[PDB]
Amino acid sequence: DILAAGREELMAALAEGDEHAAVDLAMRLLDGGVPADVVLLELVADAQVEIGVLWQANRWSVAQEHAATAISERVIAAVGDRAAAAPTRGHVVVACLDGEWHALPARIVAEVLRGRGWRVTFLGASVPAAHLVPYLEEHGPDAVALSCTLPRGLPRADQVVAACRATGTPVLVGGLGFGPDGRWARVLGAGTWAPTARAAADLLDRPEPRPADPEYAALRARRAELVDAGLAALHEWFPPLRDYDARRLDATLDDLGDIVDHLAASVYVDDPELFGEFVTWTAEVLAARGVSPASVEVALEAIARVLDDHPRTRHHLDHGRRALAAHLEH
Amino acid sequence: DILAAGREELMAALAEGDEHAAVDLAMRLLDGGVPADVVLLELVADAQVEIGVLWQANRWSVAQEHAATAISERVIAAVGDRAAAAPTRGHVVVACLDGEWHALPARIVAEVLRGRGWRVTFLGASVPAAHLVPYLEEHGPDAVALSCTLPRGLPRADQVVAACRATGTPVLVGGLGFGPDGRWARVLGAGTWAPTARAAADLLDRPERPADPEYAALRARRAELVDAGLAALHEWFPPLRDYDARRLDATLDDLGDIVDHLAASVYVDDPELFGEFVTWTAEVLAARGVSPASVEVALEAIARVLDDHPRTRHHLDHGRRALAAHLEH
Ligand code: B12
Ligand code: B12
Ligand SMILES: C=CC1=C(C)/C(=C/c2[nH]c(/C=C3N=C(/C=C4\NC(=O)C(C)=C4C=C)C(C)=C\3CCC(=O)O)c(CCC(=O)O)c2C)NC1=O
Ligand SMILES: C=CC1=C(C)/C(=C/c2[nH]c(/C=C3N=C(/C=C4\NC(=O)C(C)=C4C=C)C(C)=C\3CCC(=O)O)c(CCC(=O)O)c2C)NC1=O
Ligand SMILES: C[C@H]1O[C@@H](n2cnc3c(N)ncnc32)[C@H](O)[C@@H]1O
Ligand SMILES: C[C@H]1O[C@@H](n2cnc3c(N)ncnc32)[C@H](O)[C@@H]1O
């Protein structure tokens, strides 16, 4: 189709950092009868996933991604400066979770909803619940749409969703943070999930008590201890650490913290496949940057030792180690 | 003065969270002969400062600011989808420092440069030097334009500017992070500063050391110093005793920020950085029902620990004097 050609031309503009070409392409596609929603979901969204794949593989830098993403935002704005219908359906507030800076997925949702006649107030990146809740109380929208892209944000998602529901505002949720097929929204009972902006719009067209886990609490309270334990194990087993400068040591510490935090998220939703997928993803990220993924196994074994009398955490760690071992046999 | 009226109408749209009205206003102003640069600098920029004032005073929430800022971004895009000239002058890369997420000031610079015929690649928020440097080596732009809004980022700015210069790329710098009249850029010799997008464009139209041990100590001992501040608050500041996890975390975050701004102040050896930060902090906290006297408690505790660091000691003294003076009026 013209969509194959459109994707190639769009990626070429994004890779070149050429905002005018990307926007002009989008406008010409609209002029030729390509639906706005198709430009946003089949062209822009698809390009952004691929940019992520390239970054993950260390084939693109952060600068290259940033250039592209900013242009994709301009494409989304240009397309919405044309496809938006007069607001006749009601009012939706679109917000990212506190600590969630992937605004572009949420912007696509906002634009698609506007195209169907919703009045949308877009709040975008990182809205604290303490500020979002009074905003919902102030304006009483028909729905709040909460976007989460990182599964590590799932504990926060659960809290923010609960707080929003307590205002009586219907909650829609989405983004990659709930998993590609919405699994972690369903596990949490977190609002109504949908996979895409199109599906969100379809939902809106219809005629329509959580005890703390001490094991999760321990992963938060003992984070520094666990990072330190991982580092000490790397000191014993992983030779490159001995020659790391400040920058590489800081990256190691950052990554160790992220390992603990994803383990915490996995335990929170009690789905070991969160930690499993995280560990295999981490292996790919590190390998692509010349860091042996065996380093991860060293850290996981060390954390498992410290927490071996925490049965749920132990199970998740075991699952992570098995997933890594399986990944590394290729 | 259509600009007085324009400002009122714009702020009304922003306060209402009405993107269509704000964009339509901008377009009507352009249609009536208001220069694009005027819409961006005299209307949009001015509104964003005022949103900052309202937030600082706890009169606007984060949600209210976020709604407004996203609309201002759409105004900037709409105005640039009209005012940008064909690229004929050369190539500028526009980037925020690593850890700097105020992209909008940099977007205004980008749009104004495009209006003067520059090809601009906008990288926006938070670009690590390790990624920016190879990008500059790859593309050899005529300049890189670095934006910094938070003075706490100044030590990083100094390093990133040096790294960019080492690629042979001329560096322009700006944003609030370089201080009043660019003072902190100028004392460091960190690139060529300019106050506004207009002035940046004007510059482009022309024919063109030992590590700091006191700074190092403020970074290395950050946790210790936060803890010292907290222990003093425990001894002297009654509300802390009744704080839940959330308020305790906010206290800890703020104490860290106090240390980090002290580090920046010492780094550029300008006590007025720390002084202005402390008085700003007092206003922020007071507006949220937290006694600014709490800040004095923390500062006195940090001064005790670091009393044999002469530069740091001086900056802390200056901060305490600035706070005392602020609190008598
Ligand atoms: C651009 C980008 C960034 C940008 C985003 C800026 C912006 N303006 O949004 C920046 C640079 C800020 C960024 C930062 C980071 N990111 Co990033 N980034 C991306 C990237 C490449 C594209 C995102 C995008 O544009 N999505 C647009 C399209 C693709 O979204 P979409 O899913 O089709 O959207 C639909 C659905 O999600 C759904 N939906 C979404 N929200 C909602 C809400 C509701 C209510 C409903 C019903 C539906 C719904 O409907 C949408 C529209 O149809 C992705 C790759 C990816 N696969 O997403 C990563 C990716 C998400 N990032 C990733 C990472 C790791 C990071 C960082 C941690 C990196 C770092 N160390 O700094 C940080 C974290 C920042 C934070 N705290 O959030 C990883 C996350 C992997 C993981 N471990 O979970 C990814 C997946 C890349 C990868 N590794 O392959 N990132
Ligand atoms: C919008 C906003 C945000 C948004 C920004 C999103 C975005 N898309 O940019 C978000 C929510 C992300 C944000 C976050 C925060 N912010 Co804020 N925010 C603002 C606000 C209200 C407006 C910024 C803006 O739109 N500027 C547009 C206009 C006003 O910029 P301008 O100065 O006119 O731009 C010109 C010049 O600076 C110059 N220039 C700028 N860059 C360059 C570069 C070059 C090369 C040149 C030549 C010139 C140049 O030319 C420009 C164009 O003419 C300001 C208020 C303010 N006074 O700026 C604060 C403000 C900057 N934020 C502030 C704070 C404290 C924060 C947070 C720390 C809050 C928090 N705890 O989360 C974080 C920090 C995030 C980070 N790490 O960077 C404070 C900082 C005070 C301080 N201590 O330094 C301010 C001053 C608000 C206040 N207190 O009054 N913020
Ligand atoms: C357990 C052992 C372990 C070690 C030894 C480790 C080290 C490590 N990680 C690095 C980078 C990195 N590591 C990550 C990983 C992540 N980014 C994210 O946002 C998330 C969630 C992850 C995953 C945990 C990334 C993306 C970089 C590259 C940083 C950059 O942009 O330059 C680097 C720098 C690479 C270089 O400069 O050569 C080192 C040394 N990480 C580890 O986990
Ligand atoms: C020394 C004593 C000291 C104390 C006791 C302190 C406490 C403190 N600061 C708070 C919020 C806050 N404190 C800040 C301050 C900042 N935000 C920034 O980005 C920066 C740089 C600052 C300044 C340091 C802000 C903006 C909030 C509001 C956070 C929110 O909205 O949740 C709160 C929560 C208020 C409430 O919910 O009732 C407390 C308790 N801060 C202190 O510094
Ligand atoms: C998911 C996206 O996050 C971006 N990314 C990775 N590390 C950083 C960083 N330190 N600062 C800003 N953006 C970053 C990458 O460009 C990636 O594509
Ligand atoms: C400078 C701007 O930073 C925003 N701001 C303050 N705290 C947060 C936060 N936790 N998350 C996101 N934005 C925030 C405010 O809305 C302010 O206006």
Residue numbers in the entry:
A (entry chain A): 7 to 214, 224 to 345
B (entry chain B): 7 to 214, 225 to 345
Recite the paper's sentences.
Here we identify and characterise a sub-family of multi-centre photoreceptors, termed photocobilins, that use B12 and biliverdin (BV) to sense light across the visible spectrum. We have identified and characterised two types of photocobilins, one from Saccharothrix syringae (SasPcob) that represents a standalone photocobilin photoreceptor and a more complex protein that consists of a photocobilin diguanylate cyclase (DGC) fusion from Acidimicrobiaceae bacterium (AbDPcob) that is representative of a photocobilin domain fused to an enzyme domain. Crystal structures reveal close juxtaposition of the B12 and BV chromophores, an arrangement that facilitates optical coupling. Light-triggered conversion of the B12 affects quaternary structure, in turn leading to light-activation of associated enzyme domains.
The adenosine binding pocket is strikingly similar, with the ribose moiety stacking with the conserved Trp61 residue and forming a network of polar interactions linking across the dimer interface via the conserved Glu71-His72 motif. In SasPcob, the BV is bound with a ZZZ configuration, with Asp270 forming key interactions with the co-planar A, B and C pyrrole rings. The D ring is positioned out of the ABC plane by approximately 40° due to close interactions with Trp296. In SasPcob, the close interaction and relative position of the B12- and BV-binding domains brings the two chromophores in close proximity, with the edge of the BV C and D rings within van der Waal’s distance of the conserved Trp61 and the corrin ring B, respectively. Furthermore, a direct hydrogen bond is formed between one of the corrin ring B amide groups and the BV ring D. This likely explains the B12 allosteric effects on BV affinity observed in solution. A network of direct and water mediated polar interactions surround this central chromophore edge-to-edge contact. These include direct hydrogen bonds between the corrin ring and Trp296 from the globin domain, and a putative salt bridge formed between the propionic acid of ring C of BV and His137 of the opposite monomer. The juxtaposition of both chromophores likely underpins the optical coupling observed.
